[PDB]
Design a protein around this ligand. Structure first.
Ligand SMILES: [N-]=[N+]=NCC(=O)N[C@@H]1O[C@H](CO)[C@@H](O)[C@H](O)[C@H]1O
Ligand SMILES: [N-]=[N+]=NCC(=O)N[C@@H]1O[C@H](CO)[C@@H](O)[C@H](O)[C@H]1O
Ligand SMILES: *Cc1c(COP(=O)(O)O)cnc(C)c1O
Ligand SMILES: *Cc1c(COP(=O)(O)O)cnc(C)c1O
Lengths: 810, 810
């Protein structure tokens, strides 16, 4: 069909068809008379999987022979989403499979919609790990993703009566064809117990044991025949566990609950014991695997030369004291040598500045669960503070500020301080974020060891976020500059010479229109809701959180509605405002925000005077597969977090690559995006970080804005009087109260600027040709945001390895 | 290698080898350099499994086209044991696979030992269901086995310090290649709730729902290309289950615990709620499947003509009221018509007479868990007793004796009475057992409906219990009468004309010697224990229970030991006494019996004066796979239950078919075995049922025997004084107390006869030629005990279907 989807050769199509029938028969044990679409999906999945296996085995054999430095990416989240199409794309099998299934009388797109998303993540942090795995494989790095195989990933969101309802994400129900259980590599993990100081060294004894069973999933690089591994651990009790008889067998669930479910919090720390167990479980099993592989390649001096451990935030921070425990207690190395090895091996990536998101574990928890690790942490703190004391003599406050141990109500361990002390590199995820780290929260550490602090701006993989979800756009681009950009996104800059090309301008706009029509159809298919494909698609999709300010978006929507009602027969650019995202189960304000959105839609979408000029839809169950559908159809990307709160953001990059213009604050990566495309091609508004600080020093008083802005006052009064909740007049009292008295995110402060800049957006949309030309300038300069660039920087500046675009024999 | 194992054709061996390599690569994702024996086992299992799939699909398609009457065998136990060799035997692939693996440089026997036993049963009852499935497939019946897929089967037994230790049987750890999950056929099962009487009929509402997910396993017939299905249900919570968030997800285990573990009791009733849930779970899911299949073949008048439901004991007895519930509450049939259909559809098999083994569920349990079913049961009882009252006017005691509702401390429901009332056929499992049922426990019911009572003597499958476990014997037999006997065991009667054949006599004895050498080697391999292959192998393997009297065996062993010590230089036939079997976790006396056995061995096996003349070994973890090894190596089979307690026994039949002579009481099937072979060819001893009754009427006084038998007195005094437990002198006080004051099984009463008859056994063993000739007479007359004969009788006399030996196109 289309070029970038590969060749549909005669021999391969014939081969695919026969293997498809083979699997349907021998693997699924069915015939064409009783097979359902799901059976067909699995037959295709197994057929494609077969093509991975040869490459997977020789890739790993290759690494064994050449023995390069290995990269271990530890994360408690891997937001992978579907795997079928991604595998076909990276293996250049899309057109062949499309043809083969066509000839079998099946629609491949229909079958792809059957696969369940692998939702082992909450949002940005988890998706970043997924994009990174793709880029590491595409760049030929010997990398391994290590995490937990949650039985239940992020919950499926249902909207009932305008409220969010959560239901278990039983994603393994029908089986997972992509994973390979490896029970032969099961390892033991220890919990509780006591420390016993003998003659030679300490010993951790009387522990409870939980087995870690690994499951391997292949990670194919883009058409380079490289297939890396993502290994996820599953908790299993030992057979002598708790061994009345029946009850002992039933209580095995206690131990296996460790890998049962993903904590659904985005940028929020919940200090629960079960979570601490998950964190140590991944770290303990992973490190034994690392050391095992290392020994099978005695003198750990070369350990840092053959191993790199990247901590995705502080979730796997226990790797630092666990590595020390193993080297000191088990391998018998002296502390100083063990510490040298640990520091040179570990690197830490920070993903936030919000105080409530930082991990601070109560000492009493670590004391009971990991007694030996708490002793090691105290020792580390002792030696670190001695260093601080020697560098800043007499500065006693610095000592208490930098301590890994925080005093107070309950003593806690600051895991971020632990990570900085035990890593040779610490990085932020966007230029502005990394600078904030050095200027504020980690200022003392930067002054002690400036060389440790770096920046590695985030990115997204152009395979899943362009070729896979937007083939039409990838095609018109390839037609004019070739296919090389798919693994070298900087080449999109060549599109700049087509900004005045009438043909290209028309094609770009046509692809967008087709995407909007397709999405507009999808909305009626699976959700039954009519929308106007000619309107401007204004979308904000991301987790629901006060700092992301979906509330500011709501204020604008209500403003537009009030203006229409004020002058009904005045022309306004038609808009379809789409807002989607999940709220953490226990985050009350976030759940109220969702109710507000649907409540607004209930009024706006049924007002005869508005017509098809304004629609407000809440996108249900936003997840990776839904993102792949709505982002390609968007015109406006909403990235409006309060300056200084969104560390980077990645959804912003996805929209830029897919042809949407961006309205946002100078926050996170938005700053670098505007810098790359030129501020005149971005819709920037609001306070900058410096303005927010000025406001805080002075004291934020929402009342001031309410008194000076009539339109804003009207909105607040509508919310307060029950205009959007007739039956429950005070339903939104909490929202109004927060907005008026304790809004940590200054929604009102950016209201005027936001509405004004939204007017400029509507003005440009009225001129199709100029809107598209600006779009072209955005797509053309989005190259820097490829995760291939990000990973190459990690490789060269942190891991000490060189990326390679060399193909392996297939 | 050997004839009965099929042909090793050139084309097939080549084909097997390539498919083996294909699976090792694509399925297991390994290469010959990192593959372990387990990987090879799985590659072979998948290769053999492939050969089943074509036959499995066309068999089921066949039944759909011809639409014969279908047989549903409901059981909460299916003791299947390994599946690899059995599949090869039934598909005539054994020699080809043997050759193919040989050429690949692998020992197939070594790989077979890697497979885990499917131990979803306790003993005889569970194994019977397994043999029955094999015979039903071999006889071409459209039969389905329905049960529960326990995550943990019968526990693995470890012997520590002479005591039994139980450890979880995590048989699914490495995966099960034989099963096929069928999540698409998942059905809902209801629990708790309340009954609501409306205008038209009652309704069961406010129930808790648990999903039943089926897993299908193929059951191949013997070389007839028929492959039936065994469907096992697995418990799964609904995704909206219990839907803080985390806890709700974790509490899903509550619902899924239903299929977690098999209750480890043999002939013992434990009235636990979890067990009741398992029983209803299987019944509810199975009946919906049956009705669904029936409708897809409106007027249930033909239901009994297209459906037969066989209840394996009372465990699935709720099928009777559940069928009524569905027909009356859901289908809206009138009671009388519904009852007529139910009775004609259901048949019940009783497997015991021990009072403690009969199911009597507390009304308060059924009341809370299955409110609608308890109402239906009361109604059934009401109508049944009205029938009794009309047939036996004025007989008020009969009314209370026959009631399904038992009064007393706590009201209970007698499930056996429920089954008789709601079934058109009730059978015992051995002639003597069936007669006892009519004369004692079910006397009142027999007088009311004599036509319902039948007998169906048990049997074993000659495929697993001869060809599979004893190829050497199957071969020498085939050499002289062909292979037709494998599916027509009555032909073994032709061997009678070889009883005087010197060549045959020599071959029979040679096969036994080889089996003993092989087993003697196995004992040193996996368990490290030296034994003399020239001694008489005296074995008693079966579950540990007081009625089976392993204690009587112990008394004989100690007697032999005391006699040797008395006259050290006197000649005695060397013996290796082997006793094995598991004890239910909560059965204290049974666990003490095991300790006694090992304690005896500790003294006997280390006494210099005894030498290699007497050895006492306790066979650890007796299970199906171990049975296949020890039975072919046995010389003496111990079947010494107190007359009237062993309903049938099946281990007795396995020994007879494999060349061992039998020493036993006239109990269960032993009576028919002696009748078939001739009493002169059996070692029968002890009280008959009539003698036991005489003793009970008079009053059993163990003291009498103790006073009149010096050798017995000496033994009891040795046990009491600590002779077998030096460090713990009163360790066996409970055993002595029971034996002397409350032995329900009269161990002492049969002691003298037993020892005397054991002397006759030793006398015959001294004459190899005559011992073997008697063996030949046993093997030659064991034909009646084939489960093919048993199933043909069930088919013709109960289910109303004709068995077929016709091959299906392959
Ligand atoms: N742990 N924890 N929570 C922190 C977290 O999710 N951070 C997110 O990281 C992603 C990936 O670095 C950023 O793009 C988001 O801006 C940032 O909020
Ligand atoms: N439920 N329950 N327990 C009863 C039971 O296991 N019965 C056994 O059945 C098997 C199979 O009918 C008989 O051979 C045994 O003699 C008998 O004890
Ligand atoms: C890209 C992505 C995110 C991150 O979006 P931001 O706007 O940066 O928070 C979250 N969820 C999903 C499903 C995504 O694909
Ligand atoms: C045949 C068998 C039984 C039944 O033996 P009996 O002596 O009749 O009780 C029990 N367990 C296993 C493993 C068997 O193979």
């Amino acid at each position: 069909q289309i070029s970038v989807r590969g060749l549909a050769g005669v021999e391969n199509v014939t081969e695919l068809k026969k293997n498809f029938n083979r699997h349907l028969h021998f693997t699924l044990v069915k015939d064409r008379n009783v097979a359902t679409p799901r059976d067909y999906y699995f037959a295709l999945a197994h057929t494609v999987r077969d093509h991975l296996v040869g490459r997977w085995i020789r890739t790993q054999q290759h690494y064994y022979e050449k023995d390069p430095k290995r990269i271990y990416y530890l994360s408690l989240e891997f937001y992978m989403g579907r795997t079928l199409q991604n595998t076909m794309v990276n293996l250049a099998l899309e057109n062949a499979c499309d043809e083969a299934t066509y000839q079998l009388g099946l629609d491949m797109e229909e079958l792809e919609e059957i696969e369940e998303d692998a939702g082992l993540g909450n949002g940005g942090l988890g998706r970043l790990a997924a994009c990174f795995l793709d880029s590491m494989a595409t760049l030929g790095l010997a990398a391994y993703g290590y995490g937990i195989r949650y039985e239940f990933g992020i919950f499926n969101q249902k909207i009932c009566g305008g409220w969010q309802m959560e239901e278990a994400d039983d994603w393994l129900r029908y089986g997972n064809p992509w994973e390979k259980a490896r029970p032969e590599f099961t390892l033991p993990v220890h919990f509780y117990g006591r420390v016993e100081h003998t003659s030679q060294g300490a010993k951790w004894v009387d522990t409870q044991v939980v087995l870690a069973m690994p499951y391997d999933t292949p990670v194919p690089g883009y058409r380079n025949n490289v297939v890396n591994t993502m290994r996820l651990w599953s908790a299993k009790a030992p057979n002598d566990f708790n061994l009345g008889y029946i009850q002992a067998v039933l209580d095995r669930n206690l131990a296996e609950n460790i890998s049962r479910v993903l904590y659904p919090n985005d940028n929020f720390f919940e200090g629960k014991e079960l979570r601490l167990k998950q964190e140590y479980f991944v770290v303990a099993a992973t490190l034994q695997d690392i050391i095992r592989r290392f020994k099978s390649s005695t003198n750990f001096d070369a350990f840092p030369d053959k191993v790199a451990i990247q901590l995705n935030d502080t979730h796997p921070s226990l790797a630092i004291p666990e590595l020390m425990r193993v080297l000191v207690d088990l391998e018998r190395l002296d502390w100083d040598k063990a510490w040298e090895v640990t520091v040179k091996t570990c690197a830490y990536t920070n993903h936030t500045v919000l105080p409530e998101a930082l991990e601070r574990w109560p000492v009493h928890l670590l004391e009971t669960l990991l007694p030996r690790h708490l002793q090691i942490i105290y020792e580390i703190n002792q030696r670190f503070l001695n260093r601080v004391a020697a560098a800043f003599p007499g500065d006693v406050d610095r000592l208490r500020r930098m301590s890994l141990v925080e005093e107070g109500a309950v003593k806690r361990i600051n895991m971020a301080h632990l990570c900085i002390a035990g890593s040779h590199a610490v990085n932020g995820v966007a230029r502005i974020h990394s600078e904030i780290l050095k200027k504020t929260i980690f200022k003392d550490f930067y002054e002690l060891e400036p060389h440790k602090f770096q920046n590695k701006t985030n990115g997204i993989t152009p395979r899943r976020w362009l070729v896979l979800c937007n083939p039409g756009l990838a095609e018109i681009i390839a037609e004019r500059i070739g296919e090389e950009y798919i693994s070298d996104l900087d080449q999109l800059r060549k599109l700049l010479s087509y900004v005045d090309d009438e043909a290209f301008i028309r094609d770009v706009a046509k692809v967008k229109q087709e995407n909007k029509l397709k999405f507009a159809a999808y909305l009626e298919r699976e959700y039954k809701v009519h929308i106007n494909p000619n309107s401007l698609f204004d979308v904000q999709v991301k987790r629901i959180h006060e700092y992301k300010r979906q509330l500011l978006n709501c204020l604008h929507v209500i403003t537009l509605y009030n203006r229409i009602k004020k002058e009904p027969n005045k022309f306004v650019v038609p808009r379809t405002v789409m807002i989607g995202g999940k709220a953490a189960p226990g985050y009350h304000m976030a759940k109220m925000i969702i109710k507000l959105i649907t409540a607004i839609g209930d009024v706006v979408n049924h007002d005869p005077v508005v017509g098809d000029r304004l629609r407000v839809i809440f996108l249900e169950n936003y997840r990776v597969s839904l993102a792949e559908k709505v982002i390609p159809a968007a015109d406006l990307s909403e990235q409006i977090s309060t300056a200084g709160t969104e560390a980077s953001g990645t959804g912003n990059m996805k929209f830029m690559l897919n042809g949407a213009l961006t309205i946002g604050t100078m926050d996170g990566a938005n700053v670098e995006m505007a810098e790359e495309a030129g501020e005149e091609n971005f819709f920037i508004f609001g306070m900058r970080v410096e303005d927010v600080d000025r406001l805080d020093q002075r004291g934020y008083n929402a009342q001031e804005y309410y008194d000076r802005i009539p339109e804003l006052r009207q909105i607040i009064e509508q919310l307060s009087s029950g205009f959007f909740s007739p039956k429950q007049p005070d339903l939104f009292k909490d929202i109004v109260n927060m907005l008026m008295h304790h809004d940590r995110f200054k929604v009102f402060a950016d209201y005027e600027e936001y509405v004004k800049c939204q007017e400029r957006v509507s003005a440009l949309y009225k001129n199709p040709r100029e809107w598209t030309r600006m779009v072209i300038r955005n797509i053309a300069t989005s190259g820097k945001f490829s995760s291939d660039r990000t990973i190459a920087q990690y490789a060269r500046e942190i891991w000490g390895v060189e990326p390679s675009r060399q193909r392996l024999p297939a």
